[PDB]
Ligand binder design. Structure first.
Ligand SMILES: S=c1[nH]c2cc(Cl)ccc2o1
Length: 156
């Protein structure tokens, strides 16, 4: 898709010029070794001073051929403990749904910062996994304890 590919080239140029520190966002390759702008390997650092500090959380971003009409699918690999991350790893966030708050102008940087903000502030009206949601609701201290253990697990 020429429209998608031209936008994704724009996004990559902008990302490389200015991105938030500690974040990664890199296109993958096709079986012939050429660049695949439709599938990016990304990583989000935990925010300092939070329970997520020191973790680096790997995420795949998958673009459909009609991008930027549609948002990318954003999937933690491996899946994470968080109330708004499905067991598959897929992120549930309103800016990431075409029929909710996605707008074509939203950039990859905005998406990744939006997901980082989600990590430290769950949306309890919108749960995506039972376990993290239940613990978040029942015992915030235990929730934080689990988040810290996960961040350690995913430290570089
Ligand atoms: S290494 C390594 N593998 C990987 C996969 C994804 Cl989806 C994102 C970041 C990654 O870093």
């Amino acid at each position: 898709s020429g429209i998608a590919l031209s936008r994704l080239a724009q996004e990559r140029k902008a990302w490389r010029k200015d991105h938030p520190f500690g974040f990664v966002a890199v296109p993958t390759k096709n079986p012939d070794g050429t660049m695949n702008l439709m599938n990016w390997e990304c990583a989000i650092p935990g925010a300092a001073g939070t329970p997520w500090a020191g973790g680096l959380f790997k995420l795949r971003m998958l673009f459909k051929d009609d991008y930027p009409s549609s948002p990318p699918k954003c999937k933690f690999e491996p899946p994470l403990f968080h109330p708004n991350v499905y067991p598959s790893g897929t992120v549930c966030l309103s800016i990431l749904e075409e029929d909710k708050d996605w707008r074509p102008a939203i950039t990859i940087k905005q998406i990744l910062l939006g997901i980082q903000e989600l990590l430290n502030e769950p949306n309890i009206q919108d749960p995506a996994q039972a376990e993290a949601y239940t613990i978040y609701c029942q015992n915030r201290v235990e929730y934080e304890k689990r988040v810290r253990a996960q961040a350690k697990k995913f430290a570089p």
